[PDB]
Amino acid sequence: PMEVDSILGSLSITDDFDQLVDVTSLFDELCSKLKPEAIVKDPRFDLFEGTHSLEVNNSKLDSSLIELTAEEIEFDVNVAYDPPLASVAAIADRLLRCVISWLNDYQTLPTTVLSCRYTESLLSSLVKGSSWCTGNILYDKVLGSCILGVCYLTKFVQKLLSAGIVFEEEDLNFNNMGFNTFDNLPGQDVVINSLTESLQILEAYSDDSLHLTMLKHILKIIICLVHLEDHLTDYSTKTSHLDELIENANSVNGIFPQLQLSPPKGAFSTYIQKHRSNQFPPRKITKLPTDYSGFITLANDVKTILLVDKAESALETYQFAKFFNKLEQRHVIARILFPLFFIRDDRTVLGKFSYTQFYLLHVKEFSAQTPSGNELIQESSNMLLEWYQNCSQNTCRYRQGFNRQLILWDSLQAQFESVNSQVYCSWTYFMKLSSMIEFSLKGFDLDIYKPFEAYSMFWYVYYLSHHLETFLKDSQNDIESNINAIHSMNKKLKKLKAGEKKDQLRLKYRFAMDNEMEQLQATKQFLNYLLKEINITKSLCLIEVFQFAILKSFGLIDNKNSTPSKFSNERLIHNLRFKPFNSIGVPELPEYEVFQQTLKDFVIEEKGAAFDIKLERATNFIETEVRNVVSSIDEIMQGIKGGDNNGVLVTGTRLVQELSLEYYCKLKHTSKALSVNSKVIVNTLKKNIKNKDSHEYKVELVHTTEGWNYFPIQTLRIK
């Protein structure tokens, strides 16, 4: 207000327009003639576009009305606030925790990195071509290097998002409020040198304080964050800077309780939302993390990404994609990094194979057959790469990615089928049916399905798993037939005496052993693992189906909505749930009547002693099958620990050995919980029938805390 430039600036507002006429009166006359329902607008314009509009004099939609304190309004970057070392250290600390809040906690960029007045100041001078002079070495040189390091980081995040790997404003917010630095922002060498030079200034200080130790660790942390681009520019697998990031983050965490930090008031504010061009409503600053543990999570997640470079087969990459992001959602930086690190600049996979070579490796390890630029293979290779990329999506988008895949895998399989290419048709079928199963079970982890829908989905996945097991069993029989054909040659050689025809048979037999046998054995043991895994899935779904049928036998749950409504019917609701599988020909989606009839065979409609005998068969199956599942999981876990060279199983889990063990451990926990819960249900319901004033129960799909929540526990609970 009192400032000079705002005063004189009032006269300059109308300078651009040579002559202005007031038309307020004409506007009100015309608007009065309009009918109340009427809107005057361009005929081409759609009124939905106005649904994302701001509104003046609305506190929640007007950033011009943001309330700021005097310190927030008057904060000056050129003032060296006292005490300088403690203040600079507190400024750098909060900026780093703003980085964590932005990336780890999914907060907006305007409320984290851009809330700092120093980052705004540097980015503003960088747009034209430190940007503040305080005369103090901590503010001008040390803190300036810090701001430059973080600004270099956000620029690198912008490059990561430009690849379109993940979804904007869902996995990662990048509203930089119109900032474009062109080529003005310096390169990596300048930033690292600037941060190193500030480190040497801190070494020169004779006095040692906890604040000084803090600032040294902060500076080295920033250097490590600047080095994260090495994994894309040079595809480096080195973990030195990542290990340093962990060490320094751990040292700072022990320092946090020992000292108190207070940044200068107004250093971080919503000021930039109010005065910089902003097309979005104002947002408050969310509470920041209290420690640097988020940097540890970031460093380990990126370290996991680099492990895929060590893969020596298609099965090792496949299992890496199945497990690296499966137990819990990885950091967004690591999730963007994996597809860019896996699918590289020169249109190669890991710099080792081309796209078609990588695809043919998957077919070869699954079918054990040599091929002996095709368009079908080109499309299949692209389809497979999209499958890998979908693995690093968030837990919701992961399931949504299969919606697109299922119909594209089906169309691809039918196109292979029309040209009678049965090897690729076979592998496509395996991927489609595995994706159908994974897509369906993933709905339980996201709580998509209501308890009354539990039978429909679990039985459908059992139905799918039965077809997958039949397909895999036939595949393994063909492999064994090829293995025995080679064995029969050796038997025939022993019968043959020395002759020219024996030379032919020895020639055929030696080539097979040298070129085909080793892959056949590996494929046979791989299919052995897939059969064990799919039988575990098949058994667990059946266990769930039996559990549901026991609950319905006691009248506690039905396969439709309990409280009917006038608007819809159960057939329409059933068809809507299975719409994603409706266009897939093989295996055909069972008709609504088949779902109903199958449940009737499971449900015990008898009463009294006859009911008790049939219930005992159902509960004994659940307990017996749970123990068999535990035995199968145990065998798989032994195979994972033993490795792929032990002659029985091939799992390809070398790169994700710990994570795959942790998964099956969680799967074993869920299996045991299913059996325990079945006993609780039966004991509870037998007592309940006896009593006339029985309790009113509801069924809930409960997640096991240390289990695998593709198979929730159908739990009774008093209403």
Binding site: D22, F27, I39, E55, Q279
Partner: protein
């Protein structure tokens, strides 16, 4: 003779209740003189900034002004 339809698509000057002034292209107007403006520039004294698509209610509008050469062009 004039209509509101002639005005849409043309830059307007809308001073608000405070010292702030909005310059934007008129997108829509309703019966209660609520305006929707696109490419809005918010001018306050010395400062200027872009705010995109903004709607201004009846109470908030102090005045509406248009450039003289643009106004005659609409007719």
């Amino acid at each position: 003779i004039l209509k509101l339809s002639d005005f849409i698509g043309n830059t307007l000057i809308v001073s608000l209740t405070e010292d702030r002034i909005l310059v934007g292209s008129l997108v829509a107007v309703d019966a209660q003189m609520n305006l929707l403006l696109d490419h809005v520039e918010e001018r306050m004294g010395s400062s200027s900034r872009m705010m995109g698509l903004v709607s201004v209610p009846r109470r908030s509008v102090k005045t509406i002004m248009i450039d003289k050469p643009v106004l005659q062009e609409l007719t």
